[PDB]
Amino acid sequence: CGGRIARLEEKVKTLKAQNSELASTANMLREQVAQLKQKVMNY
Amino acid sequence: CGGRIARLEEKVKTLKAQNSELASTANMLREQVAQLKQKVMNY
Prior knowledge:
By secondary structure, chain A is mainly alpha-helical.
């Protein structure tokens, strides 16, 4: 074989990418929600 | 062929999954950071 494999690879590439995307996004909302949470800690 | 393909599929499955995972996580930090942001809007 030599066609459906390479393709499945390109697909696994776009998937792993988007993953790192939403990953960094959640990382930003996490660090920010952490500093904010601490500021809320006072009651 | 009949082995490396099915495998590449199972892999694309775990990838798409984790993707939906970090996706919902960012969705929670987004809706929460949105309601909070509004509360901060007052200065």
